[PDB]
Design a protein around this ligand. Sequence first.
Ligand SMILES: Cc1cc2nc3c(=O)[nH]c(=O)nc-3n(C[C@H](O)[C@H](O)[C@H](O)COP(=O)(O)OP(=O)(O)OC[C@H]3O[C@@H](n4cnc5c(N)ncnc54)[C@H](O)[C@@H]3O)c2cc1C
Ligand SMILES: Cc1cc2nc3c(=O)[nH]c(=O)nc-3n(C[C@H](O)[C@H](O)[C@H](O)COP(=O)(O)OP(=O)(O)OC[C@H]3O[C@@H](n4cnc5c(N)ncnc54)[C@H](O)[C@@H]3O)c2cc1C
Ligand SMILES: N[C@@H](CCCC[NH3+])C(=O)O
Ligand SMILES: N[C@@H](CCCC[NH3+])C(=O)O
Ligand SMILES: N[C@@H](CCCC[NH3+])C(=O)O
Ligand SMILES: N[C@@H](CCCC[NH3+])C(=O)O
Lengths: 556, 556
Amino acid sequence: NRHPADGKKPITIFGPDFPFAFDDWLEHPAGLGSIPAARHGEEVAIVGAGIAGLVAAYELMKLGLKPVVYEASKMGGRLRSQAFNGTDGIIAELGGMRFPVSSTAFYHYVDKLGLETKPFPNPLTPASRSTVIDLEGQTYYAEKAADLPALFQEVTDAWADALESGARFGDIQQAIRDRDVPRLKELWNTLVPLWDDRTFYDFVATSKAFAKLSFQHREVFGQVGFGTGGWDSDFPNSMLEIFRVVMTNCDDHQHLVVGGVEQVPQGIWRHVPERCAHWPEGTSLSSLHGGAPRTGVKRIARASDGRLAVTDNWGDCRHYAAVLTTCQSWLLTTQIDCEESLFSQKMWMALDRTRYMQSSKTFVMVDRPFWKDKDPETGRDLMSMTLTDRLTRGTYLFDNGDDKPGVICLSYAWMSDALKMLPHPVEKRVQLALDALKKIYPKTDIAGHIIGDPITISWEADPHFLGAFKGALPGHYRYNQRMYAHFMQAQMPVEQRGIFIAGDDVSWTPAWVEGAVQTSLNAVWGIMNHFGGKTHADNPGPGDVFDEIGQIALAD
Amino acid sequence: NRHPADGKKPITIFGPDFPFAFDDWLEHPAGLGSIPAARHGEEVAIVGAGIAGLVAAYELMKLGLKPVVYEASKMGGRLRSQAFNGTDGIIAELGGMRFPVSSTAFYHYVDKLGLETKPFPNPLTPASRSTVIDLEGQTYYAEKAADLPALFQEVTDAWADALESGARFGDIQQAIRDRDVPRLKELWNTLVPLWDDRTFYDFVATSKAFAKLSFQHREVFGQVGFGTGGWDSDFPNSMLEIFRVVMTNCDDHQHLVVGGVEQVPQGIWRHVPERCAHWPEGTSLSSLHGGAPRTGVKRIARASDGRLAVTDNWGDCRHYAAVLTTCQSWLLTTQIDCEESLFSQKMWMALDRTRYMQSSKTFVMVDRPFWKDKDPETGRDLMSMTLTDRLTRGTYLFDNGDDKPGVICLSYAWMSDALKMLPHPVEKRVQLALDALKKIYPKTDIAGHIIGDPITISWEADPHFLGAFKGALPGHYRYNQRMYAHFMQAQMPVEQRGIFIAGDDVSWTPAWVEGAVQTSLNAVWGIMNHFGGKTHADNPGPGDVFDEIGQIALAD
Ligand SMILES: Cc1cc2nc3c(=O)[nH]c(=O)nc-3n(C[C@H](O)[C@H](O)[C@H](O)COP(=O)(O)OP(=O)(O)OC[C@H]3O[C@@H](n4cnc5c(N)ncnc54)[C@H](O)[C@@H]3O)c2cc1C
Ligand SMILES: Cc1cc2nc3c(=O)[nH]c(=O)nc-3n(C[C@H](O)[C@H](O)[C@H](O)COP(=O)(O)OP(=O)(O)OC[C@H]3O[C@@H](n4cnc5c(N)ncnc54)[C@H](O)[C@@H]3O)c2cc1C
Ligand SMILES: N[C@@H](CCCC[NH3+])C(=O)O
Ligand SMILES: N[C@@H](CCCC[NH3+])C(=O)O
Ligand SMILES: N[C@@H](CCCC[NH3+])C(=O)O
Ligand SMILES: N[C@@H](CCCC[NH3+])C(=O)O
């Protein structure tokens, strides 16, 4: 139980758009349901061996199907843990790195695997010893929030007030705690039509609290943020997306997975459940595949026999009664030739109009966590978690024990600040970061502690992603609602049935692994239903309650 | 005279933020002023040989200085015309392509060089024979606006009414026509605090006209636009930016330069004025350089003698009393080591927070303008200017005469639609565009007419730009105001004087060539002033009236 020890019922990612108890579904001893025995052993294609792909595969295998996973690049997708030269257990998190404990469906799989987690070192948490804020050449050091000048407290207070006055934050959170669905939906559904079409930035600037403060206060709020770095990158996003972040504590109480979160997908791959339908004891996704996913998918089409024909990179064509796609949504045009008649024209527009955000990270390894040392004159740590308006933006320090090498994320950038780095090689990104940090820390010799190889990523640049994660712009609620409900196919024409989607791009909470796991499980219900299956009476699943508690539809 | 023949005083790009008559300044027989003879021949460095750099060089040469232009990549910057294999006069416009005749300072140079222009083929203009709109698989063909279904006219009506009700469009345009400065500033200054912090989308959705229409109406408005393609890409931008586009007719009455707009910067380079101060007859920028700009700049610092030290790619270091930089703003951090004390901390923030937009274009050549042929059954053109929600977005047809080859821009994309193409090679971009067009035109064999080589660009990818052009996000008014005014140095500390900036990123109107020219001319005044010069009493210039009619400052 990683929840904060505050004596309350815990905040979880429980809707608010679809407040279904994924955790309870997953933990119930009846299982996720059954498929008729005569269909046991039939294949279902799953494009993408990211977390959504492998979650859907694992559970469908448990239901007595043979998932067939395809993966065009690397195992784990945006959960990716690259090992530094010559080390064991020392990694850089290139995608997902800090996992809110509200992510109960994600953590089900973490615990099923027996993996260890620890608090992530976000600013001003017990996990981080100190934080340095550097803005317009003015540098502030703090071991607790009270060490900061008054403006920073004025900003936090205004933010908390805008959420309470503007969104009924307190009431929503209590309903989440209690899992009081009618109440949560009443409270949430009111916000949906009021904020789809307005931005994060608009919410802030027009709120009472910020409107009476200087421009500089909301500016500073953009650059330094509310617990997890500056979110000026997301000022443009629809406010509903942000409401979702804060209401479900995605931005608080976060852990990193010891040894790398890539152990989650790699472990699901290899995991042998005690009880599968159909399959013999000792069966895993890996044993069913003979060890690897298939190669990348090049084409999806409807075959004359009514099945879906999937052709790989090397022209191998295989037929399936159903196909789940988990690649980011653009790839169904840019990377796969997906026959158009497989989605409605309304669906294509959702898939095609979804915006993906940009992200950069640059990492080095260091011989020891030297930042813990004290400057004798000042009493400060030699280095801190760094928030700045310089090009690095966010710098994060990873302590692996005094007797092991440290890891430093030199820069974690979003959007514009990511785009600055796009065409530059690793050596240049490192240099620029180190020069930026030398300005903030003139006395600290970081370069002198650096060992191993540097590691960078730009998710935008990779043709298998075309972005770090979705970001909902204002007015995209309708596209999301279509994509999120696509697993409910009882009213679709026959020509559109049997193909499914999932991923954090399908979810209402992109950039958060829980969104990939929950939509993945919705698709599991959908695929089960497609094979003539159904949930157990004592353990109803997504599609059994979707029509009553799913996301509101808006007007045409 | 390329202005519309409507018998009115023409709309020009006259403010509204700084309603200075650049064209009058330029055309006045007295010239732009003078610099004391004792400083004739001294050097001023100019970073970048795009339009802002070459304009500033040209005029400073005329004032008796020796500009020294640096260029790290290609001549002309974002005015780029690439010639297709084996051809003469047949180009693709990779940057700037359609130049609003309201751009009177830009067209001063076009006409000084004697270049020929013709109306650009935008949808439903005399320059275009027909337009095809393709949305959610429904295709509409039109030779005049009246051929379109009713919804499209409801959209245009609502857009025009939102501008009239919401922005006093009529009154502002009249004040622009009359060059009534007090009135224009009154009418504009009211809008500045009201729309800095709000998006284009918010302007549209909350306007009376669109709020009573369906979502689908503003959705279609995003995909199809108001004369120059769909601008859903800019829905996130501050509304002040859009107001500036429409109020100054940037989006109407556009011409292309025959033979390519790159002839403008290449012609300025080579142009020999009748009278320069100091320089002998026959002097050009080219003759003054020996033919070529210097190579790229790697560093700018304050030398111990007070001058500015500029070090090129090859380590050659040269000293200057002044330096103009015209590269896009990020490059003063990514591409040049620009000493931090050379700009104020408020300026660095403007420079570093500015957002750059993405843009893609894919072009092919064809043996003849076969699109003009008629399908005998339908009476339609074989192909039209195409607006679509497919990945191409906008397709443009260039007729060079029946006896010459045609040029087709298969796709001109912004933002997300640009990002789709980022990592893909030209061949892939062409194929995707042709497969999208096949769907819209199943009977037209475009591929069969294609000849020559394909041409693509992604401005985001190029380390000498890092974007196509700035796009002001809500709340960016203050950063633009800082950048726009930086050429006024009378109250700066000494350590910050002598460096200047210019470019369409400095301007209020990014993505428009007139913004680069006007800011370039402000920099001209600033540099003249820096060398102890002044304008002629009968021809006052930017910095002589800036304190009285320049851009309003906003509160802290
Ligand atoms: C920089 C960054 C930081 C993040 N930080 C956090 C965080 O701190 N906390 C958090 O909770 N979440 C975080 N996330 C989000 C998290 O990583 C995602 O929600 C999740 O990993 C996405 O999972 P997915 O299954 O939806 O898709 P993916 O991980 O994208 O998996 C999809 C797979 O499809 C593959 N594919 C593509 N094309 C084809 C093809 N033609 N054929 C076959 N396969 C193909 C891809 O290679 C990929 O492996 C972060 C993401 C990024 C990018
Ligand atoms: C896709 C696109 C479409 C456009 N369409 C239109 C249009 O339709 N109508 C219109 O009016 N305008 C349009 N524009 C805008 C127009 O192209 C610009 O406003 C203008 O040409 C930019 O001039 P500039 O001098 O500001 O900068 P740039 O043209 O970027 O010039 C800066 C120069 O400096 C160089 N440089 C960079 N780093 C260094 C270094 N370290 N040292 C030396 N030099 C360096 C660059 O290589 C470049 O040559 C468009 C722009 C784009 C990208
Ligand atoms: N341009 C620098 C910052 C200089 C100003 C810092 N206050 C950067 O992005 O890192
Ligand atoms: N969940 C990620 C991304 C947050 C920004 C969302 N656009 C993080 O905590 O870093
Ligand atoms: N995915 C296709 C569009 C299919 C739907 C078109 N109405 C594209 O981006 O071009
Ligand atoms: N001048 C460019 C403007 C692009 C939109 C600017 N955000 C064009 O006409 O195509």
